[PDB]
Design a protein around this ligand. Sequence first.
Ligand SMILES: Nc1ncnc2c1ncn2[C@@H]1O[C@@H](COP(=O)(O)OP(=O)(O)O)[C@@H](O)[C@H]1O
Ligand SMILES: Nc1ncnc2c1ncn2[C@@H]1O[C@@H](COP(=O)(O)OP(=O)(O)O)[C@@H](O)[C@H]1O
Lengths: 615, 618
Amino acid sequence: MKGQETRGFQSEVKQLLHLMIHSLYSNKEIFLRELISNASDAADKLRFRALSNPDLYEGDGELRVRVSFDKDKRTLTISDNGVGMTRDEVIDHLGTIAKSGTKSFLESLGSDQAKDSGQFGVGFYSAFIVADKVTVRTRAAGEKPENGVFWESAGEGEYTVADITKEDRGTEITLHLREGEDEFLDDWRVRSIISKYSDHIALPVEIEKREEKDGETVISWEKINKAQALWTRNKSEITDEEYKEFYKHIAHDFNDPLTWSHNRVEGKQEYTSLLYIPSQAPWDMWNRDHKHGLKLYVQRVFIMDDAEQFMPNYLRFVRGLIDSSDLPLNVSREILQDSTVTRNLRNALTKRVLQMLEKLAKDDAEKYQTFWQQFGLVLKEGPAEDFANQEAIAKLLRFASTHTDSSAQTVSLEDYVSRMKEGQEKIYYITADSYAAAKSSPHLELLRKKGIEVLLLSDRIDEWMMNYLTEFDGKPFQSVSKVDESLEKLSAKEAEKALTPFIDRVKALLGERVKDVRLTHRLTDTPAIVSTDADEMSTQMAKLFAAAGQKVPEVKYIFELNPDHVLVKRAADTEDEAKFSEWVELLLDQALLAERGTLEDPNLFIRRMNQLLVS
Amino acid sequence: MKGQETRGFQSEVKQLLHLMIHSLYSNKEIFLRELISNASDAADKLRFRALSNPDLYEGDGELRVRVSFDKDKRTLTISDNGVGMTRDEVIDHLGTIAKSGTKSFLESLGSDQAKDSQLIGQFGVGFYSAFIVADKVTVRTRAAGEKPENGVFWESAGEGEYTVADITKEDRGTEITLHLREGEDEFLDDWRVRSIISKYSDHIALPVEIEKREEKDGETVISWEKINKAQALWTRNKSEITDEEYKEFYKHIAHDFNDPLTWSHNRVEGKQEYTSLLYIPSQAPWDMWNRDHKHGLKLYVQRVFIMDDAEQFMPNYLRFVRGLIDSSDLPLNVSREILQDSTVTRNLRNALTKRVLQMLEKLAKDDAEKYQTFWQQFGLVLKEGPAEDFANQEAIAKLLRFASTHTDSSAQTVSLEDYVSRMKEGQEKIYYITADSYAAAKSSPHLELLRKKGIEVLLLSDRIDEWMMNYLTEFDGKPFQSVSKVDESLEKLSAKEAEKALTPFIDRVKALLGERVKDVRLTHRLTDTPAIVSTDADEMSTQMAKLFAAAGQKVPEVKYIFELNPDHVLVKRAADTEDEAKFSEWVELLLDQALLAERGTLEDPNLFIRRMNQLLVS
Ligand SMILES: Nc1ncnc2c1ncn2[C@@H]1O[C@@H](COP(=O)(O)OP(=O)(O)O)[C@@H](O)[C@H]1O
Ligand SMILES: Nc1ncnc2c1ncn2[C@@H]1O[C@@H](COP(=O)(O)OP(=O)(O)O)[C@@H](O)[C@H]1O
C-alpha cells in the first residue's frame, strides 16, 4: 500500500451512481456478463500484443478467467491472467465509470421508455449492483511485478488507488457481496448464468468446484465450455474409425486417410494440431494457387476454412486442421502474413508432417507406396523448396532403378546405398523422357552389365530436382549421360590398338556439328553413342527449356564410337567417300535419336539408312 | 381518372403531419435527397427483377430519373422509369407515411434533445418530406409488367386524406408532381436544384437528368443534362480517343507494358445495355496455361466498379481477351454467384464472344503482320474453340491457321481459305497429317505421293490438333480427310507401263506374320519409301492411340495394314530371296522400318536396328 491516494468527488455523483447502477436492478446478474467480457478483451488484447514482443507471456501460456468464492467473508472473486491495467489505466477507467453507459442513459432520460419501465447497460460499475465493496488488484504485462495497482471503492463518488505488488500478471476483481444477495455464492447459479454467455465469450471461464469425497474436500477448476472437439480428446480415447470418419467429413472426400498425426503443443506457441495424408489426390491438385486443407481454429473457435500459409507447396496435399490459442482471434490471412508467428508455426508443422510420413514408411510401406503413387510428383518439389530438411525429404523420396524390372518405383535411396558394391563411391542416375528410354539407353548397357545400380528418372521435374539434391549420405550424385573420368577406366586391357585415320576423317567430314569425336570402351552392343560433359548445357536441361517453350539452347555434343562392334569397323573400312559419308551419317543420326529422344525427324535418319540399303 | 376514391384517416393526424413534416423545416432541401433516392431504389429494384424475366424492360434500356419544372403553374416534376408501384403498393406506402420517421420521432419525444432548438432537424420523415415545400403532391405511376391501364393516381394535400384512382400511362415508372408553395420559388431554379442534387449524386445509384433549355439557333431547345459526367475512358465514343490513349489504357488495366494488338470498343443500346471495351494482348502472360483462374474482364455496373475479373463473360477458348465491360441494368450488388443464377449472364457472354471473334476476323483482314504475332501467341488456345462453341465453328475455323506442304518453314501461316483457294480442279477433300512434331509431319511416308503430285496437305504437329479435327469436320463444303488413313478416293489416283501380279510374295508375308498385321497389300503410293503401314476401316487411328497413351491409359490395340511399294529396290530385293531365314529377316526389317515412321516414338529403335544389323552382318 505505497503511495496511497483517495480521489473522491462529490455531490449527486454520489447520488447519480445510486441511480444508474440501480437502474440495472431488474437484471443484476448482468454484472457477470460484463466482468467476464472484460476478462476476455483482456486476454485477446494480450494475445495480440504478443504477436509481437514474444516474451509478453512471461512463459505462462494458458489464458483463463477464474471465478472463485468465499462463503465465509462472502466474496465473489473473478480473476484473469489477461493483459491487466497499469496505474493510469486504472484511474482513467475504473476511476470514472462508463462513457457509453452514462451517455445512452442521459439521452434516454425523460422519454416514456425511460420513465415507465431493464433496458440498459452500465459497465464495470455494474458490480456495485450486488457488491458494496469492489476491490481490484492488478498488474499489466511487461511491467515489473511491483508496478501493481490497488483499487477499492464503495461505489460512491470516491475510490482509493495504491501501488501494490503481485508476482502474477492479470486482474483480480474481488466483490464484497451485499446482505441479501447470497444467491451469488451458489457456484451452480453462477455457472448456469455464465453458460448462456460462454458461446459468445472469447475465453476459458473456469468455476471453482468444491466437491467433497474420500473424506477429503477437493477444489477443482471446471471449464464450463468443455468444447465438442474431436481434436481435443487426447490420442488415448479415439477410434481409428473415429479419426477416419473425421478426415472424411472435413475433406468432403470419402476414401480413408492413409495416416494422421494428432498432437498437442504446450510452451512457446500453443496449439493442438491434427493432420491427414489423403489417399487420392483430388481434381484441383495441379491447378491454381488455391491450396485448401488446413482449417485454422482459434481457441476451439472457427476462423477460416483453409490457409495455404501453414503449409509449404511441396506438402499441399496435407489435409486437416490446426487449433491455436495465443493466436489472437480476429486474425486473418493478412495479419498472419505480417506476423512472424506464421513463419514459425508453418515450419513446425512442416516438421510434423514430414515425421508423420517417415513413420508411415516404417510401418506400412504397402500403403505408403499408394501415397507415393498419388503424391510423389509433388514431394519432388521439396528438395528445391526447403533446404532445411533436404535430408528427411530425400529419404521419403522413391525411384525406379535398374535392379527392378517394373515401371513402378519402389527404390529407397537407402535401398540404393545398402546394395552398393565395395568401392562404389557415386550414385548414378539417367534422365529420360520416359521409363522406356531410361531402362533402354546406350549409357546403360555397361553399368547394367557389371550389375551396378542406376537410377531411372522419367519425370520432367527430376531434371530439376537433381540440380539441388546433390549428395545423399556422403555419396554424391552423378549421371550416366555424362561420361566421367571415374568410370572412364572401369577391367579392360590385354591388347590395345589405334584407329585414328577415319576418326580424323569423321572429324573433318562433320566439322563443328559435333564438338569432338572419340572411341570409348562403353562396350555395349550399341555402335555409336553421343554425349556432352565439360559443364555444358546438358541434354535434358535443353529439353527442359524446350518444355517451358524457350529457344532450345545449342547442345555441344561429343560423338563416341565403339571399336569392337561390326558396324563401327565396317563403316570404318569403306573407302568410298559417298558411301562412307552415308555410313558415319547413319551412325550419328542413330545415336541422336537415342539421346534427343523425340527425334525431330525419325524419317531423316531412316532415309539415310534407306539409301545405305538401296544403293 | 376511373374508379376515383378519397380515403382519409383523421384526427390530430391532420395535425401530426403539420408536425413532423414541419420538423424538417430547417433543411427543406432534403425532400430532393429523399425523392431522388426513392427513384434509385426503383431502378435497381427493377434491374434486379430483370436478372430474371427478361422482358421486364419492355425494351427500353436506359434507366434515369428526370427533374423538370414549370415556372408557369409552378410545378417541380421528378420522374423515373424505375419499377414503379401497383395500386396496393401505393395505398400502403404513399397511403400511410414513414415507419422509421414516426418511430425515431416517438422514442425521441420528451427528451432534452427533442425539446430545444433546431434539433428538430433530427427526425427523418420520408416521402412525405415533399409536403414541406409542396401543398399538393400528385403521383402518377405504373409498375413493370402490369398492363398500361393498371396505372395509379395519388393526389394529396398532405393532411390526413389522399385520393387514389386507376389511370393509364403507356410508359413505365413513377411521376411525382409537386405543386410548390407560395414563397418557395427557390425550387424552380434549375441551377439551385442541380447544385443541391450534385452533393448526393456521388452516393446515388442512378442517372439524375435535369431539364436544361436554351433559346439557341433562333429556337428554344430542351436538352436533358446528366448531373455527373463520369471520368470514363470507355465513355467518350470512338470519335474522341487516341490510338495511344487506348494503348496506354490497356497497359494500365493489364499490368502489362507491351501494346495491344487490337481492340474493340462499342456501345449497345436496346435489350441489355452496356459499353464494352476489349483488348487482344501481344504476349500471353505466365498464368496462361495453368489455373482455375481466368482474369481479364473487369465488370463495371453503372460506371461503377464491381469486381476485378469474371470468367463468365468469356469462354475458355478466348481467355486471353483482356479489357472491361460496363453494364447498366445489371443490378449493382451483383456478384459471380448471382450472375451464375441469372440468364443475362448466358446472353451477355455469348454477345461478347461474337464481338471478340469479329475483332479478330478484322485483325486478319487489316494487318496480317500483327495477326501472325497473335496466332504465334494464342493459337494453341483458339484451337480449343472448335470443340467448345459449335455455334461459331465457322467464324472460328477461318481464324485458324496451319502449316502445310506448300511451305517449308516451321512457322504456320496457311488460312483454310488459302487452302481451298489453291485447291486443284476436281480435288474434293482437305487432307492433313497428324504427327508428334513438324519434322515427322513434313517428312512422313504418307506424304510423298501427294507432295509429288503437288497436292496441298496440312501439317498438324500440336497434340490438341488430334483433338480438334474430330469436331472440325468440314470447311466450306469440303470435308476433312487424313493422309494417315488410306482411302478409296486416293486409292486409284500415274505413269503405269509394264504390269503384272505378285502373289507368292504377298501371301508368304501374310502367312509369316499372321495376326500381327491385319492385312498386307501393294500400293501405288510410289516414292523413295519401300514399306509403309496404315489403318482405316473406322478403327482406332494411330494418334488417337497416342492420345490414350498421353492421358496415360492402356494404349489401345492398333489394327495395322502393311503396305509395300512394288517399284522400289528393297521391296523387290527382299521379295525375291528364297532363303526362309534371310527373307524373314528382310520382311521384318521392312515392317519395323514402317512402324518407327508411324508410331513415331518407336518403343525400341534398337530392335529395328538390331534386325537390320543381322541383315548386314550375316
Ligand atoms: N479485467 C480487466 N483487465 C484490463 N482492463 C479492464 C479490465 N476490466 C475493465 N478494464 C478496462 O476498463 C474498461 C474501460 O473503462 P470505462 O470506459 O470507464 O468503462 P468500464 O470501466 O465500465 O468498462 C475497459 O475498456 C478496459 O480497458
Ligand atoms: N418512386 C418510387 N417507386 C416505387 N416505390 C416508391 C417510390 N417512392 C416511394 N416508394 C415506396 O414507398 C416507400 C415505403 O413507404 P413508407 O414505408 O411509408 O415510407 P416512405 O413512403 O416515406 O418512403 C418505399 O419503400 C417504396 O417501396
